[model samples]
Target chain A: VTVAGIGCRKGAASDAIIAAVRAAERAFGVTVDYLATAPLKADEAGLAEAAKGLSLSLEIVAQERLEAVAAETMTFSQASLDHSGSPSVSEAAALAAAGAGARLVAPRLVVGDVTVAIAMTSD
Target chain B: VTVAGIGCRKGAASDAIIAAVRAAERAFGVTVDYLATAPLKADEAGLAEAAKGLSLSLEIVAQERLEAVAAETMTFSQASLDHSGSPSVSEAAALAAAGAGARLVAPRLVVGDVTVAIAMTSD
Candidate 1:
């Protein structure tokens, strides 16, 4: 399965989040199967709207999962810790949702205060 | 100075490239002063148009610089060499343009076929 994980400012627009995801999809040449985000942001309008627009189910990664994958991230961000209580919200969420044998497709892509990362289960 | 370096497939749309840049700008909370990309794509329509749209000057990094920074990239891609003769186009361009004292703000961020990385000179 391929999953997209996103992190953004508290009130970022859905348009921005979707734009980032689409851009990553195009860049990586892969269709996104599911959308994931930190638990606190799972209910945010933008994320929910993005999931609806993309026709992908949304999964919220628990704080423990996020923490478990944080150290494995390529670009560790203190800002993410401050804002989301995880070292790297987007990368962690993507990897966690992708499961144990998952591999990151790329590092986080940030645009307009929105960050996204993708992970896929190894075939 | 802050610089954002970009890479894209041939004939990518300007809107997609710019959207990626705007997204990155927001994610990092930094205004990009200059844009950079591999030399061969210096005149590509999408990147040029993105530069015009963002009001940032464009710098083209040579193959050598891209090679110089390839080892430093967190996620190395052989595909980049197949396409552009460099291990990384965006991250290398950003670092090369930022000069000797520069440091990567983060790993490359790919949106669509366009990849971008930001580099900043130390104070």
Candidate 2:
């Protein structure tokens, strides 16, 4: 399974998120099976809109699950750490949602108001 | 003057950068007068192409200049610091390029492979 992890500012627009996701997909040449993010961001209307816009399911990764895999992420953001207690929210969320034995196919990439990462399960 | 500051990974595509700038402009409802980035990124073909695509001049802020004003930026990225010795390359570059008495109108926002911030000169 290929998963795309997303992180964004509060009140970020769905258009920005969708654009970032599209760019990431094009850059990596992979069609994401799922869009994932932290529990805290599950309620973001923009995220929901982005998922709907892309015709993909949105997975809300548990905080514990995100933190459990954060240390393995490639990118680090102090702001992300302060806000979410994770070095890279997007990477961790993608890794977590891709399930056990998942590995990052792309590190987090910052666009305008969003960050995106990709992960894939070995199985 | 309104300046859009950009930061991106090496080899990022111009389309991604241009899309991010457009998104930032739309989000803020402001047209940018210039596009700015750190000196180390001045030679990026993607950055140049984005600037040309937008029909805006690209200003390369000196490293010292970017670091001098980095503390005033709203966002902090450890990866940015590790790579460029700045807390927020996009915000600092914007502020620096906008000239004296410039203030950030918009904080850094992550898109896909790009980060953008906007600053305006009081003059």
Candidate 3:
């Protein structure tokens, strides 16, 4: 539902957001994705009413509204090697990277065993 | 203690592994590192001895041996704007992306309250 409130300043709203999205689709050959968008525009009142209109979840309103996004974490994991002495260490290393804590964005060698990651703790 | 093992192939142990390590260091200006390499030369006897030489932890092996890297995920998080109706909504969106599920790899727009974060559910 479109929120009712003080709207954006009467000025040029850059098409950059839309243009970039379009350019990305053309570059990647992917198209329109998403169910719908509940855009809380930067209205003059800063869209407080818009936020209240939907709450953290548009579905329900609790005593507390979640003003921020769900700031939880997630993991993508896979086990490359079990206790096998058979697979090449290289293979195991690759597997570890693919499922590493950072989700293995880079092709990395685990050195000895991928302990240090993202400058966090060892192992 | 060095391992007593059925060793690698006759020769051509191509310094590749060490070279790869060194090249990474030089290319990135990282220097002399590590205690020593176990170098389980993906070969004949498979260096089961090398593995056994260093316990899963080099000190203690739990009842269960960790044949693979110990993997536990982590999160990088920040709460940019609270439920403030003052800050620009764009500021809030930036805050969400900085600590998004993927740890903010490449900047992206949070069209909404960032529900789809690897954040388990549609919170």
Candidate 4:
């Protein structure tokens, strides 16, 4: 996908391309960003192949996750975490999307995976 | 180690327990928490054994690192980033420790390896 919207694809990474490959695709859809499902193995190999050359910014999770990743690799900054505590993580993601001034696809984790999906598009 | 402190035991993961064994160990002087070398492999496995029963909190690094970690995993909050831009990563770390209301051992990354070391304790 060219970009991830304010919500996730379906708690499933496969939900990508297909969602972005829709009819109008980038033109008709309100989506715009995608965060990797895991740290790009490229960075780990020290080849920088994982990210290629696209990266608007990084996303934030929690201290535990951050520590784990940090132990394995290095990063410059963390994605911003939504501590606003909105009713749902989707709502919080929507807020982040709105703030970014673009459509995005961050998910709301329930236990550990995305459950609800949020999309923004005009009829 | 019982809990993580303000600095890592060594640049090498293998250095953990050995460093912990050298002195009065936990009682000797200063030491602390160890961020999972990678997002707890357990988080990915869906079983929390990676971290076992310890976790004072998580450490924050860069956003790039955070997103990659978040794509497949779920976390509640992120570690605070030291945007203060101290003279060096170690200095920035010490600043973080001072602020965490405790000690810490966050390392600065260069090409992706920690080359500096910092420790704290009393005589």
**Whole-model Cα lDDT per candidate?**
0.68, 0.70, 0.21, 0.28
What TM-score does prediction 2 earn? 0.43
The candidate scoring highest on lDDT is: 2
lDDT of 3 by residue, A19-120 (tens): 333443354343422101112223212222222222211111111111111111111122222322232322222232122231222122122211111111
Stretches > 4 Å off in candidate 4: A1-112, A115-123, B1-11, B14-28, B31-56, B63-87, B97-123
- Cα miss at B103, model 1 (Å)? 53
Model 3 Cα shift for residue A82 (angstroms)? 40
Please state the error at residue B17 of candidate 1 in Å: 44
Off by over 4 Å in 1: A41-43, A71-87, B1-123
On the 0 to 100 scale, the lDDT of residue B101 in model 1 is 59
Better of 2 and 3 by TM-score: 2
Q: Rank the candidates by TM-score, best first.
A: 2, 1, 4, 3
Q: Which candidate model has the greater TM-score, 2 or 4?
A: 2
* DockQ class, candidate 3: incorrect
Following a full C-alpha superposition, what root-mean-square deviation does model 1 have from the true structure?
A: 18.2
DockQ by candidate, in order: 0.01, 0.01, 0.01, 0.06
Misplaced by over 4 Å in model 2 are A1-123, B41-43, B71-87
